[PDB]
Amino acid sequence: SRPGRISQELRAIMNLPEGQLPPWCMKMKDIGLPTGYPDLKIAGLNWDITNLKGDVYGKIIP
Amino acid sequence: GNTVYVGNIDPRITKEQLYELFIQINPVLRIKYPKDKVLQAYQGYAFIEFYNQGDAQYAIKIMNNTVRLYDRLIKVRQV
Known part of the structure; x- marks a missing residue:
């Protein structure tokens, strides 16, 4: 398990x-990115939306 | 201050699923997920311990009423 990916099991x-931003997207645009993951990039926020692909919606990128 | 209460959890949900979900929102230290040991059944709620109060407060603001698991809307509150 890791931030920015969600397993098939949890997705069901x-x-x-696959390919859809998780439902906390709107609230992260309002409140900000995780306080505990300074280098998390989320597709459509601070990472290009084209990275929203398959089971991935974000990535830790230092 | 570092722990949140999670409610409306379908008893099919596993601790590993709760961990995968909440690590999307901030790093998680531990999860306490009460079980009736006679029936081996979860009880609809859990305590998620984050590493500090800021990270817990952030999780409550982001996650309360935000996600449905097995079509049930998850509640996240300070405790």
Whole structure:
């Protein structure tokens, strides 16, 4: 498990298809990125939206 | 101050699933996920311990009423 990827199993449980931003997206645009992951890049926020691909929506990029 | 309460959790949910979900929001130290040991059944709620109060407060603001697991809307509150 890691920030920026969600497993198939959890995706089914969340009803979050591959290629879709997770439902906390809007709130992160309002409140900011994780206080505990300064280098997290999220597609459509501070990483190009074209990186929203497959099971990935973000990545830690120092 | 570092721990949050998570509610409306379908008993099918596993501790590993709660961990995968909440590490999307901030680093997680530990999860306490109460179980009836006679029936081996989870009880609809959990305590997620973050590393500090700021990170817990952030999680509550981001996650309360935000995600459905098995179609049930997850509640996240300070405790």
